[PDB]
Amino acid sequence: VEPLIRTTISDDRGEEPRYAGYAASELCSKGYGIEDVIGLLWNKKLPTREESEIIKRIVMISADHGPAVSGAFGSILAACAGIDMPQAVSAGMTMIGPRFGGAVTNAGKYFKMAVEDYPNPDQRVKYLVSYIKNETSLHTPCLDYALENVDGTIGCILMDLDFPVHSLNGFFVLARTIGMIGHWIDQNNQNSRLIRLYDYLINYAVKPEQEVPEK
Amino acid sequence: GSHMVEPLIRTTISDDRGEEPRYAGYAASELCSKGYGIEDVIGLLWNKKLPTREESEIIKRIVMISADHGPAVSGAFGSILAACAGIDMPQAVSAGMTMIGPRFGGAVTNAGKYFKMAVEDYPNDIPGFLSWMKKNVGPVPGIGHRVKSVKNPDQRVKYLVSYIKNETSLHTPCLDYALEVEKVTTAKKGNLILNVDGTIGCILMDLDFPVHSLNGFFVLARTIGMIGHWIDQNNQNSRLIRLYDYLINYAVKPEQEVPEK
Amino acid sequence: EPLIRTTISDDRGEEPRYAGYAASELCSKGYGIEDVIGLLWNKKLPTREESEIIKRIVMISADHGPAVSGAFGSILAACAGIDMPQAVSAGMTMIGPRFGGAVTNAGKYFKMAVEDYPNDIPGFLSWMKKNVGPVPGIGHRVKSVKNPDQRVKYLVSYIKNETSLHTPCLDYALEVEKVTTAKKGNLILNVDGTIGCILMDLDFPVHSLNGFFVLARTIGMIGHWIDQNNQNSRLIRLYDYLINYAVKPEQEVPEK
Amino acid sequence: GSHMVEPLIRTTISDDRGEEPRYAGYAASELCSKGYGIEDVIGLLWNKKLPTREESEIIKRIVMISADHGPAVSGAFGSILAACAGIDMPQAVSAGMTMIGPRFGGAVTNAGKYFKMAVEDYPNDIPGFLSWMKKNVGPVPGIGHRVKSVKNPDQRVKYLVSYIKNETSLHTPCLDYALEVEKVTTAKKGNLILNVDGTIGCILMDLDFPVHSLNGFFVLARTIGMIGHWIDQNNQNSRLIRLYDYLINYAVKPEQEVPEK
Numbered sequence: 001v002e003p004l005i006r007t008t009i010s011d012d013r014g015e016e017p018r019y020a021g022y023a024a025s026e027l028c029s030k031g032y033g034i035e036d037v038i039g040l041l042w043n044k045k046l047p048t049r050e051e052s053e054i055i056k057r058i059v060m061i062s063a064d065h066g067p068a069v070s071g072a073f074g075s076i077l078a079a080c081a082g083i084d085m086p087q088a089v090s091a092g093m094t095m096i097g098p099r100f101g102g103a104v105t106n107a108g109k110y111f112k113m114a115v116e117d118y119p120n121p122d123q124r125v126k127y128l129v130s131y132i133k134n135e136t137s138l139h140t141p142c143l144d145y146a147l148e149n150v151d152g153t154i155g156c157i158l159m160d161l162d163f164p165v166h167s168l169n170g171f172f173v174l175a176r177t178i179g180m181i182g183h184w185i186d187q188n189n190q191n192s193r194l195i196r197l198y199d200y201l202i203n204y205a206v207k208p209e210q211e212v213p214e215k
Numbered sequence: 216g217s218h219m220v221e222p223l224i225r226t227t228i229s230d231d232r233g234e235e236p237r238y239a240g241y242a243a244s245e246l247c248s249k250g251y252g253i254e255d256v257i258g259l260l261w262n263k264k265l266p267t268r269e270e271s272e273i274i275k276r277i278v279m280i281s282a283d284h285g286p287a288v289s290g291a292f293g294s295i296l297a298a299c300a301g302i303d304m305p306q307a308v309s310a311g312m313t314m315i316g317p318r319f320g321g322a323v324t325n326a327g328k329y330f331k332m333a334v335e336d337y338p339n340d341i342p343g344f345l346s347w348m349k350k351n352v353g354p355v356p357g358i359g360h361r362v363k364s365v366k367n368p369d370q371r372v373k374y375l376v377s378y379i380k381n382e383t384s385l386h387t388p389c390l391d392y393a394l395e396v397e398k399v400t401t402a403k404k405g406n407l408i409l410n411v412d413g414t415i416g417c418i419l420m421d422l423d424f425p426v427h428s429l430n431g432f433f434v435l436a437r438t439i440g441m442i443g444h445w446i447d448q449n450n451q452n453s454r455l456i457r458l459y460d461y462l463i464n465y466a467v468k469p470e471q472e473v474p475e476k
Numbered sequence: 477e478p479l480i481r482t483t484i485s486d487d488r489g490e491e492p493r494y495a496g497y498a499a500s501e502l503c504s505k506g507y508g509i510e511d512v513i514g515l516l517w518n519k520k521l522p523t524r525e526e527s528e529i530i531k532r533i534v535m536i537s538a539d540h541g542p543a544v545s546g547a548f549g550s551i552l553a554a555c556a557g558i559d560m561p562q563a564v565s566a567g568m569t570m571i572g573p574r575f576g577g578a579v580t581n582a583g584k585y586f587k588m589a590v591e592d593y594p595n596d597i598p599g600f601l602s603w604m605k606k607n608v609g610p611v612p613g614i615g616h617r618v619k620s621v622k623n624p625d626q627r628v629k630y631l632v633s634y635i636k637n638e639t640s641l642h643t644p645c646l647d648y649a650l651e652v653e654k655v656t657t658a659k660k661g662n663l664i665l666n667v668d669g670t671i672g673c674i675l676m677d678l679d680f681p682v683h684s685l686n687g688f689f690v691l692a693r694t695i696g697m698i699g700h701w702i703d704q705n706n707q708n709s710r711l712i713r714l715y716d717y718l719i720n721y722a723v724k725p726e727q728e729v730p731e732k
Numbered sequence: 733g734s735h736m737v738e739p740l741i742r743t744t745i746s747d748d749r750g751e752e753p754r755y756a757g758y759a760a761s762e763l764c765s766k767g768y769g770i771e772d773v774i775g776l777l778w779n780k781k782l783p784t785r786e787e788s789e790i791i792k793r794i795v796m797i798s799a800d801h802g803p804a805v806s807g808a809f810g811s812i813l814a815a816c817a818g819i820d821m822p823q824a825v826s827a828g829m830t831m832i833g834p835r836f837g838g839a840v841t842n843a844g845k846y847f848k849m850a851v852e853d854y855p856n857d858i859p860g861f862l863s864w865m866k867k868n869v870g871p872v873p874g875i876g877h878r879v880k881s882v883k884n885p886d887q888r889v890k891y892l893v894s895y896i897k898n899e900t901s902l903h904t905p906c907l908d909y910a911l912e913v914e915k916v917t918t919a920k921k922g923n924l925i926l927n928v929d930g931t932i933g934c935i936l937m938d939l940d941f942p943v944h945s946l947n948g949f950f951v952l953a954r955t956i957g958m959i960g961h962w963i964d965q966n967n968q969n970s971r972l973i974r975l976y977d978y979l980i981n982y983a984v985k986p987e988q989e990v991p992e993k
């Protein structure tokens with residue numbers, strides 16, 4: 001039988017799943033964390049302890065940015081429409097792209113090009129930068145070039161961690177899913193009603209009323 | 216003219232109007248600096264409370280254990296179909312996530328609800344609980360699996376139960392009840408095991424987590440796997456999928472001529 | 477062993493076949509979009525009367541402005557630079573029990589009410605409150621007895637006066653509306669209720685009912701995406717004065 | 733409190749504030765009463781113009797021909813996967829719709845854009861257009877078919893081209909160029925015919941529909957089929973899909989013990 005799909009990251013056929021060769025429960029038993037599973041499933045590599053400390057902080061820092069932004073607001077709109085959590089969160093996730101979250105992969109991409117082709121106050125940035133430059137020994141050429149914005153900081157850092165270029169948006173997608181789930185729960189706890197924008201929030205730049213011509 | 220504005224939405228969990236975003240009143244930079252993790256942010260945004268150490272260790276294992284279960288299941292396969300169709304990651308994973316529901320992944324909330332109801336209303340009457348569920352609800356949420364069974368046990372379930380019993384002091388009436396239900400249901404049919412959704416739901420009810428939050432633990436964890444599958448197919452440059460003809464049981468109308476109007 | 481079973485369409489022959497009919501031949505013989513809907517959702521070519529009803533349901537339901545959840549979700553995605561299909565998929569995800577997707581249940585319960593509570597609307601309303609919750613097909617955020625929904629009035633008048641359809645479900649729902657609007661003005665028979673009743677009276681498959689709204693409102697959601705793209709609209713961020721920030725006091729993180 | 737409001741959204745296509753919706757200024761029920769159709773509402777909402785009778789006849793045919801292509805293809809299959817997972821219709825169809833993009837449906841808009849570029853840049857130079865495309869794009873979008881060819885024509889294409897040439901007086905420069913391109917490409921290899929995506933994409937550019945709108949015709953038409961498939965699976969009470977193990981090539985890492993931290 002010719003297979004329909006080819007997978008390289010996980011095997012569910014045994015007693016429990018294997019993530020890049022490692023048993024899920026053995027990762028739990030030996031003290032590994034969510035950040036380690038992220039490394040295994042997205043990069044097929046168990047992160048080093050410093051890499052795991054950076055992944056953890058990137059996800060924590062990126063988890064939510066309030067209810068006003070497109071991802072969270074999409075989830076809220078769906079929550080208020082009575083849609084179930086997974087589907088509501090999927091609507092918020094659909095907002096992630098070139099304008100909402102996209103500054104991470106683009107920063108990473110252009111600062112990598114800058115390092116190769118042109119080699120020669122936000123408290124979260126000052127925290128992240130000081131953590132990676134002082135509490136780790138990770139070589140951060142892209143970040144160092146950028147130092148010579150949180151999306152800029154995170155994007156440079158992920159290119160410097162050698163994560164595949166295809167994986168970079170994953171950090172923002174996963175992290176913001178925590179906030180979007182949270183917003184859905186918050187609206188459900190409040191028993192929020194359907195949202196319908198107020199008329200004065202809309203500029204109805206519409207055609208004048210006209211009668212339909214006969215045919 | 217001006218307008219008297221009434222708020223459109225009300226939010227209690229997060230705010231970005233200050234110096235940096237605040238999660239249930241706490242700054243993310245401070246959470247990072249003081250040694251907290253992803254499991255702590257999950258607790259703040261979903262329960263508005265910093266988890267205890269015992270809770271954080273449980274949340275971490277729930278997420279790790281649930282992260283992925285291969286490419287054959289609806290969530291992963293949906294993400295893979297979209298990846299092969301050349302769809303960008305967030306939109307591809309949204310398609311996979313849309314599969315999460317009563318049958319696949321999204322039975323956590325209702326498993327917690329109904330096992331808690333059973334503990335309260337049928338503590339010494341599992342057959343009463345099962346009969347009530349069959350007549351009034353349908354399949355018992357958190358019971359059953361397409362591939363795991365008495366002969367092919369789910370070590371993810373065995374691990375979470377062993378961890379709770381041995382590495383914590385957590386009192387678990389819902390989980391203990393569900394394990395007694397599993398003995399009764401698996402005597403009827405081997406497929407009627409206590410599954411991962413049922414296990415997680417019971418543990419989270421025993422931790423008194425918000426009832427609405429329960430499915431969130433699966434949704435979030437399995438997003439890790441779905442992103443992983445999208446990346447995997449992109450690394451392989453996988454082509455557009457068309458389901459093979461032999462896998463489709465066609466039972467279609469005969470070819471027929473359109474009649475004149 | 478097969479993975480799925482399918483009965484509605486087949487692309488293995490010379491061209492795709494919809495319930496056994498070739499689309500080129502349906503076009504050539506003067507059939508329309510409404511006939512293809514009937515073939516793919518009911519496996520039968522509609523009668524001329526049925527096709528005229530389907531057409532009108534779709535046209536009447538196509539759009540209801542940018543303020544409503546489906547359109548606003550599509551607009552939010554358009555403004556975020558998301559491509560059309562994925563943006564409209566976000567809008568479509570909003571269609572459910574509160575907005576747009578009460579057609580199926582409205583048809584299901586009004587059809588049962590005709591048989592089980594023929595001369596007892598209070599008994600039906602009591603059964604629903606205990607067994608279901610809000611009556612699907614009743615209520616609206618903006619339309620009411622004081623601001624009637626002319627879409628509902630039009631569809632009801634078209635059916636009752638311009639077709640020969642026997643409408644026990646729709647007639648029952650109209651009697652229900654007299655009872656509920658006497659209690660509260662917002663409890664009108666809404667578009668979802670009207671469509672659901674009409675489709676049950678037409679003996680359409682019960683699972684198909686929400687499809688008429690999902691498809692029709694896809695026209696509108698695509699329109700809003702195109703409109704925002706033509707305007708080169710920017711990323712939307714909800715104004716802070718539209719949000720009641722009932723957030724926890726800013727606190728210092730305690731030591732572990 | 734009172735605020736000086738700036739509108740959050742600007743809309744030009746429809747007004748819902750009155751007794752019924754107004755599509756590009758026209759009352760929805762009056763379009764119904766005066767004998768207009770779905771295709772007329774499509775033109776009003778997507779182009780802000782009531783189509784001419786001939787444009788209306790073309791829109792109708794495009795939608796009908798594009799409505800479904802069987803259950804094996806990504807959009808329908810996504811809807812079927814969600815239907816089998818117990819997901820409600822709108823959410824299930826949304827998953828299938830997510831598959832629509834560069835590989836599935838995208839050849840319509842790509843063919844339109846490039847045959848329009850050829851009419852403008854290579855008006856009487858098909859070899860130059862075909863030389864540039866092979867260098868900067870690869871296979872010409874809208875050209876080629878696996879099973880169809882000169883010996884076995886696509887009757888939908890022959891029907892549509894014949895309709896627009898013999899039942900309308902519409903000027904079709906993009907479609908005319910694509911038919912001249914087909915004469916050159918079919919002479920090289922018989923299978924390089926003008927396909928249905930190429931025929932539709934060219935026609936839409938010739939009807940002067942906005943460039944942003946072209947994908948709408950496939951999206952809306954295939955929503956008919958995706959709804960159909962969801963209903964079909966629900967009528968059957970189909971069970972959850974989980975791909976059989978033999979359909980997966982598990983090109984996975986060797987099993988190893990987790991190292992100590």
Ligand SMILES: CC(=O)SCCNC(=O)CCNC(=O)[C@H](O)C(C)(C)COP(=O)(O)OP(=O)(O)OC[C@H]1O[C@@H](n2cnc3c(N)ncnc32)[C@H](O)[C@@H]1OP(=O)(O)O
Binds near residue numbers: 353354355356357407
């Ligand atoms: C991480 C996860 O996804 S774990 C799974 C989460 N889902 C749930 O917990 C929901 C409840 N469980 C179920 O719906 C099912 O067991 C499924 C969908 C998970 C798997 O079932 P399937 O393999 O599709 O089989 P199907 O639904 O036909 O059930 C097989 C038989 O077991 C019975 N059965 C299956 N699950 C249950 C259940 N939870 N309660 C009662 N009876 C059940 C069915 O009635 C059927 O019996 P029959 O032979 O007399 O007809």
Ligand SMILES: CC(=O)SCCNC(=O)CCNC(=O)[C@H](O)C(C)(C)COP(=O)(O)OP(=O)(O)OC[C@H]1O[C@@H](n2cnc3c(N)ncnc32)[C@H](O)[C@@H]1OP(=O)(O)O
Binds near residue numbers: 194576609668
């Ligand atoms: C195209 C469409 O979307 S048409 C609408 C389709 N939806 C339905 O038919 C589902 C049933 N209806 C409903 O859920 C609601 O009427 C909605 C969501 C459409 C609008 O309601 P909202 O404006 O959000 O108001 P809310 O849900 O708070 O209800 C208003 C009041 O009317 C009552 N009410 C509203 N709809 C119903 C109903 N269908 N049955 C019974 N009571 C109802 C509520 O109980 C509430 O009463 P209260 O003031 O005593 O508490």
Ligand SMILES: [Ca+2]
Binds near residue numbers: 210211
């Ligand atoms: Ca006039």
